[PDB]
Amino acid sequence: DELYRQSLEIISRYLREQATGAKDTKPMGRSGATSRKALETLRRVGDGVQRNHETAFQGMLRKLDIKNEDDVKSLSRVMIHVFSDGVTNWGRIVTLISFGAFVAKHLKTINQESCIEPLAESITDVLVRTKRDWLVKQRGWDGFVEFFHVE
Numbered sequence: 361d362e363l364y365r366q367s368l369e370i371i372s373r374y375l376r377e378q379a380t381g382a383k384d385t386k387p388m389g390r391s392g393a394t395s396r397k398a399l400e401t402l403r404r405v406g407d408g409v410q411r412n413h414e415t416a417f418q419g420m421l422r423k424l425d426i427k428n429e430d431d432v433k434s435l436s437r438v439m440i441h442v443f444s445d446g447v448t449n450w451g452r453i454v455t456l457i458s459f460g461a462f463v464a465k466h467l468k469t470i471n472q473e474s475c476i477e478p479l480a481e482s483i484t485d486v487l488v489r490t491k492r493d494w495l496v497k498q499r500g501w502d503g504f505v506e507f508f509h510v511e
């Protein structure tokens with residue numbers, strides 16, 4: 361499943377980098393150029409999204425009461441509820457990932473960094489399993505990058 365692996369490398373790097381403040385300088389895998397431009401796209405757009413929904417993000421974070429990895433594994437159901445039904449567009453997907461980053465920052469603050477990568481997996485798993493065909497028709501991460509690109 362190459363779509364899942366690409367999505368997880370992008371999402372995982374964006375989440376851990378938002379939580380630690382440090383960029384990950386390890387080379388990317390195949391489709392490296394696209395994934396690097398996708399992660400740059402998320403650094404430009406994602407922080408605007410998080411500031412924009414700060415009130416709603418904080419409310420939802422508190423209502424989910426995340427404390428350990430078992431809590432992290434119990435988040436897919438609400439995630440799926442909020443994300444699955446209705447219209448899909450790239451902004452919705454950025455919002456998914458962006459709240460992911462918001463939560464990853466929280467996990468780092470309560471010294472639960474080890475939960476960031478299960479978080480990332482859960483996010484990727486919900487994305488690819490619920491939006492795969494859409495992702496394929498928007499040409500995947502190249503479609504994402506082209507969508508948010510301005511010259």
Ligand SMILES: Cc1cc(OCCCc2c3n(c4c(-c5c(C)nn(C)c5C)c(Cl)ccc24)CCCN(c2cc(C(=O)O)cc4c2ccn4C)C3=O)cc(C)c1Cl
Nearest residue numbers: 413416417420435438439442443446447452455456459460
């Ligand atoms: C990591 C993780 C990610 C995650 O992601 C879930 C999917 C992303 C998401 C959406 N929404 C969220 C809200 C939220 C709520 C509730 N109220 N308000 C005001 C907000 C901003 C919060 Cl607090 C957090 C995340 C989201 C609802 C509104 C925007 N929207 C959207 C919803 C719709 C729609 O309902 O059809 C259409 C949309 C958008 C955005 C663009 N379009 C077209 C979403 O799909 C969820 C969880 C639990 C986890 Cl753990």
